[PDB]
UniProtKB/Swiss-Prot annotation, chain A:
Localization, UniProt: Virion; Host cytoplasm; Secreted; Host extracellular space
Description of how the protein assembles with itself and partners: Homodimer, homotetramer, homooligomer with RNA. Both monomeric and oligomeric forms interact with RNA. Interacts with protein M. Interacts with protein E. Interacts with NSP3; this interaction serves to tether the genome to the newly translated replicase-transcriptase complex at a very early stage of infection. Interacts with host NLRP3 and ABHD8; these interactions disrupt the association between NLRP3 and ABHD8, increasing NLRP3 stability, ultimately leading to increased inflammasome activation.
Range within the parent protein: 247 to 364 of 419
Organism this protein belongs to: Severe acute respiratory syndrome coronavirus 2
Protein's name according to its UniProt entry: Nucleoprotein
Limits of the CoV N CTD domain: 6-123
Amino acid sequence: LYFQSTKKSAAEASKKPRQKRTATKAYNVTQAFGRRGPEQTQGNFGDQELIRQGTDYKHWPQIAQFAPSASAFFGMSRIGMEVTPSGTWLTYTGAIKLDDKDPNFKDQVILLNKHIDAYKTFP
Amino acid sequence: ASKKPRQKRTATKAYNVTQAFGRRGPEQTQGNFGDQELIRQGTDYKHWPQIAQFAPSASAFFGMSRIGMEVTPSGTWLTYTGAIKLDDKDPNFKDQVILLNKHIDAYKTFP
């Protein structure tokens, strides 16, 4: 059920297009999506545990409930296309509303805030 | 179909893009993507798979994006922004550019 990263398995995982990668303990968030940080187009989400575990994180389902389906991604978002010296890029922005009538709402807010910009508190 | 929270809905002919995700338009909380055909068909659209190849996995959505939380008078919102690179070595790259051009801000020309 759980694997360790090897250069071998990392080289296979990395063949997927970025947007279709799945981070796991064997191919962690940093490996799949780059170091967390403040820059534009750099990811900022994940504390040390989530970074190391990806979708093996024990509370992953409570984060994943907020990730959009392909239909909703293209349906909800503002989509743009930019051509630059690095290539052609599909840009996306949007927002997903949390349901504040869910009795779990306060816990959802706390879990999301725990990972947003967590990288600032560790190397 | 509409029982699902917004972000988990799947548009089809039976429950189309406007029904699931609202009218296309310019404001920040609206979507801007899809011509009249995609809007009416959703994931039944004939070229849906060629669009869907750019949508992120759940892991990639939380891994690539800049994620925020904003409390506004309407509610608490999980904000997201990012960019996905097209593979310009893919022999289908030209067609992908054409396909995306057809749907981005297509609403601007609707009667």
